Design goal:
Strand content of chain A: 25-35%
Strand order of the largest sheet of chain A: 5-4-1-2-3-7-6
Number of strands of chain A: 13
Order of helices and strands of chain A: HEEEHEEEEEEEEEEHHHHHH
Oligomer: homodimer
Shape of chain A: elongated
Largest sheet of chain A: 7 strands, antiparallel
Largest interface: A-B, 37 and 37 residues
Protein name (chains A, B): 3C-like proteinase nsp5
CATH class of one domain in chain A: Mainly Alpha
CATH topology of one domain in chain A: main proteinase (3clpro) structure, domain 3
Organism (chains A, B): Severe acute respiratory syndrome coronavirus
Subcellular location (chains A, B): Host cytoplasm; Host Golgi apparatus
Bound molecules: ligand J7R
PDB class: viral protein
Distance between the termini of chain A: 13 Å
Subunit structure (chains A, B): Exists as monomer and homodimer. Only the homodimer shows catalytic activity.
Radius of gyration of chain A: 22 Å
Chain lengths: ~300, ~300
């Protein structure tokens, strides 16, 4: 029993974190095979950042403008290229600890583990959800750029996030491992801000199924609802609209609990309209939306506490 | 910015998890140097558990009654002993991935990272606090016994918890790495239950200091309080009594924010009496008590957002 925000074991990623220095700036890089990936703003000064032209800044650098430190060892750069908002540094040594890996672009609402690193040294690990406004509510200080987000399936690491910046409201933005930003953000110092956010409806429903799997049914009711009638309530409370694709995704959790998806939507509607009456669900006084259906199946028992 | 329940990177511990089999039971073990540690109830059957005599059960086993699997490799047991509620198995191979480590017994209210493992394979990582009633609110299924809790200081792993059981309310109990249980629990199937719990006052205060460090002061007031007047309110709301030792511990966080400890206690008293008025603190609608002062200093900036 129990239900926690649970990250993937981070060991496979720890053996890939390095330090990258360009001039006076140091940040983290990701060392896979003979390549080190890091944010391209490592080549910028404080003044460059206000209006950088990265093509023009990078042509002025050589291979020996970059220092890569893997633990105690210096790695020699033998090539460099830019891929969107990432710098790719070729190094003289293949990482012996390179795991089986993939680069994936995750979708809003999906979750991943974050390995916070400073000066190439892993510092902490926690679980994050990609918000609908393409930010994450991470925990990051200066020096955290280059930190990565990942999922692990069996022995294969799926890297999906590299950290680049913190926005004025304190939330965080970055790229996939092809250097394409999540969201409309850019790596320059401008007045950009995160857009308005919304609650991840699919995740709230998955989490309510987790509560039933783990033995709690107090929030259910005798009612059902249509997609359209639920989405009218969802609009009022700033929830994402429920789609038929989301209904189909909840199929297995609906089958394990015997609660039809639209019946659980009637439960959620009632929770939104009446509140929770000073009760808790899986220890929470609010509706959690940072667990996907996959996270619930990963963590919960396959047998419901009936 | 940001503030998350953050675990230590788990890689150093992952390289120490093995599988231990005795008869039909399989659970996790901790492999350090030439020794594997695991719960002694691995030698019990379902019937033994109702009333086991572990001295009598263990004398009936040989070295080859135990199978240890480290990844793909079988480790040969060459010795076995019991230390309190743990089995110690000597094996023919020293773990090459053994980190610098220590065994510590943590105190109630302190936190640690948990590496959940099944069949000797790490599954997930999350952060837990030792409750005052000597349980932890973990996330564990059958097969999780032998999973360990740890902290990491620099490159030294301080193991403090090994998982043994889940209690009727769904919370978890276990031992230190000398096999002594936290709390009054025993490794046999009886009617034992977790005692009544209480809120960790020192941690709530540390977390309020984190909120101020990160830029939020809405919950402060112009009042101060004495230790005794606070503890009268603490008794009413099921908070641990505040001691002078706890006041001394908060010294550095008080210095960084310029908020005297007894002034922050006046703030907390007002929060307990008036509620939070539909506001949040560091994203939470409730008062968090699973962050120690050490956790706050570890994660927060050393400069306050004034
Ligand atoms: C704070 N401000 C921005 O982060 C920022 C804002 C904008 Br608008 C654009 C960029 N940009 O184009 O890179 C930004 N990144 C900074 C500029 C140069 C590259 C790295 C810089 N950021 C960090 O070091 C950083 C990351 N995470 C959490 C932090 C917490 C405290 C202090 C710093 C950080
Ligand atoms: C459930 N019941 C107890 O866990 C239990 C209760 C008491 Br009272 C005493 C013991 N005791 O003396 O060991 C217990 N451990 C069981 C007995 C043999 C040793 C391992 C057993 N437990 C687990 O496998 C287990 C651990 N964590 C979370 C779980 C979630 C679901 C199912 C199982 C677990």
């Amino acid at each position: 029993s129990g239900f926690r925000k649970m990250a993937f074991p981070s060991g496979k990623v720890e053996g890939c974190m390095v330090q990258v220095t360009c001039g006076t700036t140091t940040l983290n890089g990701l060392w896979l095979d003979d390549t080190v990936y890091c944010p391209r703003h490592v080549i910028c000064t404080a003044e460059d950042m206000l209006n950088p032209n990265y093509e023009d800044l990078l042509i002025r650098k050589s291979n020996h403008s970059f220092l890569v430190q893997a633990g105690n060892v210096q790695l020699r750069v033998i090539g460099h290229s830019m891929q969107n908002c990432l710098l790719r540094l070729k190094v003289d040594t293949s990482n012996p600890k390179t795991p089986k890996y993939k680069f994936v672009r995750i979708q809003p609402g999906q979750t991943f583990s974050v390995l916070a690193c400073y000066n190439g040294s892993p510092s902490g690990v926690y679980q994050c959800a990609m918000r609908p406004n393409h930010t994450i509510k991470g925990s990051f200080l200066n020096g955290s750029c280059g930190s990565v987000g990942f999922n692990i399936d069996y022995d294969c690491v799926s890297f999906c996030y590299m950290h680049h910046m913190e926005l004025p409201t304190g939330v965080h933005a970055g790229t996939d491992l092809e250097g394409k930003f999540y969201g409309p953000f850019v790596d320059r110092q401008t007045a950009q801000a995160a857009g308005t956010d919304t609650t991840i409806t699919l995740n709230v429903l998955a989490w309510l199924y987790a509560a039933v799997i783990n033995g709690d049914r107090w929030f259910l009711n005798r009612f059902t609802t249509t997609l359209n009638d639920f989405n009218l309530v969802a609009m009022k409370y700033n929830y994402e609209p429920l789609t038929q694709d989301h209904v189909d995704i909840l199929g297995p959790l609906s089958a394990q609990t015997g609660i039809a998806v639209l019946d659980m939507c009637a439960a959620l509607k009632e929770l939104l309209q009446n509140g929770m009456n000073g009760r808790t669900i899986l220890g929470s006084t609010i509706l959690e939306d940072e667990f996907t259906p996959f996270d619930v199946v990963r963590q919960c028992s396959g047998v419901t506490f009936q």
